[PDB]
Amino acid sequence: MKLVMAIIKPFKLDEVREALTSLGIQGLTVSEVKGFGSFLPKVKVEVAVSDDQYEQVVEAIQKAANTGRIGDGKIFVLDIAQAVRIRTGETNTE
């Protein structure tokens, strides 16, 4: 599993949601953050994705969140060492 995190313009959240839903990605977690540099509001999207699917997810988010203008933000991929499903206590394979 990989954690895909993106810091996006807030008005692109619905486009990102549509792209992820269309791909069948579950577990989208959203929070509001401040992009300092005093600040511009941003949305942080996070989703944990299988190793097999993460690059597709990165590309989908990138295309949906893009404007080509400054401030578009970045997508980060971090390795997840272990993921546990709380419902069943099961550790991941994918």
Of 10, 18, 34, 56, the residue at the interface with a copy of itself (CB under 8 A) is: 34
- Judge whether 9 and 72 are in contact, CB under 8 Å: yes
Whether residue 11 is annotated as binding a ligand: the answer is: no
Under the criterion CB under 8 A, does residue 76 sit at the interface with a copy of itself? yes
62 Cβ contact list (under 8 Å, min separation 6): 75
- What's the min distance (Å) between Cβ of 10 and a copy of itself? 13
Do residues 6 and 44 make contact, with C-beta atoms less than 8 angstroms apart?
A: yes
Out of 11, 22, 56, 84, which residue is the one contacting a copy of itself (CB under 8 A)? 84
Residue 52 Cβ vs a copy of itself, minimum distance, rounded to whole Å: 15
Q: Which of 52, 68, 93, 94 binds a copy of itself (CB under 8 A)?
A: 68
Residue 73 has a CB neighbour count (10 Å cut-off) of 19
Could you give the 3-state DSSP secondary structure of residue 16? helix
Annotated binding site for ADP: 27, 29, 48, 71-74, 85, 87
